[PDB]
């Protein structure tokens, strides 16, 4: 019998900052135990300083990103080139995803951007269309390898001030864009070591008031 769903592996990671948002994802594309391509862009700039990536089944991820980019175009036509807010984009994607509730897009999507007050925003979507804004969210095969490390290093979970015997938690400070990229790079470098479906390169799209900035970093190719 025909199985309409596949799994092309890969991993995505969105982190929201005080005045920035980064959406990173490995560029490897796989099928079973074989490498399809080593540089397949997975994170896309959808306009209006919104970066979107759908991870999981590539055909549905491509179709959903294709349909969202189309939705943004019609938003500009209908609303006189009005910039689509990140929350408005997030709600719009829920209707794209839930419009196929009983034949879902088998993809976990993350969109990053800046909210109306300029703070970094990251939304993560369940395959059937549940979204909830988050400070950082990894998705894909190596989410469990990446995400626990970012909780410890971004949110300082389980870390207490030395000498207070665990009474005082380490204060949450402001991580600059540069420092987050180091954590993103080390998170994906670590996942590359221990996950067979992660590697070949790391694509990071930085969303900021200046616009969307793109960076690429090499990963192990084995």
């Amino acid at each position: 019998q025909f199985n309409p769903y596949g799994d092309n592996g890969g991993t995505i990671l969105g982190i929201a900052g005080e005045d920035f948002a980064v959406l990173a994802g490995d560029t490897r594309n796989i099928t079973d135990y074989s490498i399809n391509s080593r540089y397949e862009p997975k994170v896309f700039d959808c306009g209006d300083n919104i970066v979107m990536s759908a991870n999981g089944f590539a055909a549905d991820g491509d179709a959903l990103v294709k349909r969202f980019k189309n939705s943004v175009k019609w938003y500009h036509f209908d609303h006189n080139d009005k910039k689509l807010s990140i929350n408005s984009a997030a709600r719009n994607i829920q209707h794209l995803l839930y419009g196929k509730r009983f034949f879902p897009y088998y993809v976990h999507t993350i969109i990053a951007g800046l909210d109306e007050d300029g703070k970094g925003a990251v939304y993560s979507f369940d395959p059937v269309g549940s979204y909830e804004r988050e400070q950082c969210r990894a998705g894909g095969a190596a989410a469990s390898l990446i995400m626990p490390f970012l909780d410890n290093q971004v949110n300082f979970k389980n870390q207490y001030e030395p000498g207070t015997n665990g009474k005082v938690k380490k204060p949450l400070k402001y991580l600059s864009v540069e420092e987050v990229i180091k954590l993103v790079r080390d998170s994906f470098t670590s996942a590359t070591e221990r996950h067979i479906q992660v590697g070949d390169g790391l694509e990071i799209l930085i969303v900021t008031k200046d616009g969307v900035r793109k960076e690429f970093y090499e990963l192990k190719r084995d």
């Binding site: 389980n158 870390q159 001030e161 015997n165 665990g166 180091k182 954590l183 080390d186 470098t189 084995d222």
Partner: peptide
Amino acid sequence: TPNVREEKQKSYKFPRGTTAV
């Protein structure tokens, strides 16, 4: 050994006393 890992971007040495006991 064609797959030697590259140096990490930051050192993750915790300060002693970070863990609650």
